[PDB]
Amino acid sequence: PDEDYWQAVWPNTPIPNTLKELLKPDTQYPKTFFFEHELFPGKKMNMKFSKIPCVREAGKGEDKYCAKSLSTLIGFAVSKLGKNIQPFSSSFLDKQTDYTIEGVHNLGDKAVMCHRLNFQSTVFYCHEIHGTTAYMVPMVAADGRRTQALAVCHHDTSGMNAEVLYEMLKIKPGTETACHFLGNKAVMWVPNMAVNSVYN
């Protein structure tokens, strides 16, 4: 049933294993924050993970939605971005801490983010992004395995706890772009145009 729904839209594509996993009926949130100029080949990242960062309908806004099934999830994503999109998510590895950045791929500023809520039931809180650039960041871990994670840089750097901006980056709102990674439980939908980059 589920893949039927999917293949109707994107025939001759499977659900990617990341998404396929998130659709099954505690977590880690990466806590590390950084500036854009720290995304470069050879950057050593020591990743700090926290056990702690709809039911709360905060979708007063049309640009926000609370998806309960793959059908509704796709519906919302395409309603904002159209059909030519792919879902991505981070793939931090189980007990690895230290990674080296291999490269940094710009995914642009139009996307939909979906956060898998920690309930047993498949539930995602989905919303559009604004004033923000997304990146895909391939990395190699200490044990030699290669993976990748999604980073988000907020450039309208307002509307956040000035204290944490200061804590992490010794800066206060409005001035400079603050970036952080997303956890494996997030899905981000992105246009195919962005991904192709040079190749299209």
Question: Which residues of the shown chain bind its own copies in the complex (CB under 8 A)?
Answer: 36-43, 102-106, 133, 135-136, 138, 148, 153, 177, 195, 197-199
Measured between alpha carbons, how far is residue 148 from residues 14, 51, 93, 99, 169 in Å? 20, 21, 10, 10, 24
H or E element at residue 166: helix 162-169
Question: How far apart, in whole angstroms, are the C-alpha atoms of residue 47 and residue 65?
Answer: 30
Q: Which is nearer to its own copies, 72 or 86 (CB)?
A: 86
Looking at residue 82, its amino acid is G
Task: Give the span between the Cα atoms of 30 and 53, in whole angstroms.
Answer: 9
Q: Find the shortest distance in angstroms from Cβ 142 to its own copies.
A: 19
Kindly tell me which of 22 and 149 has the beta carbon lying closer to its own copies.
149
In the structure encoding, which two tokens stand for residue 10, read together? Answer: 């994107």
The nearer residue to its own copies, 54 or 195, going by C-beta atoms, is 195
Run of H or E residues at 78? helix 70-81
Is 37 part of any known ligand binding site? no
Q: Min. distance of Cβ 63 from its own copies in angstroms?
A: 26
Of 39 and 81, nearer to its own copies (C-beta) is 39
Smallest separation (angstroms) from its own copies to the CB of 177: 8
Given a contact cutoff of 8 angstroms between Cβ atoms, the answer to whether 150 and 186 are in contact is yes
Is position 154 annotated in a ligand binding site? yes
Binding residues for Cu(2+): 154, 180
Binding residues: 154, 180
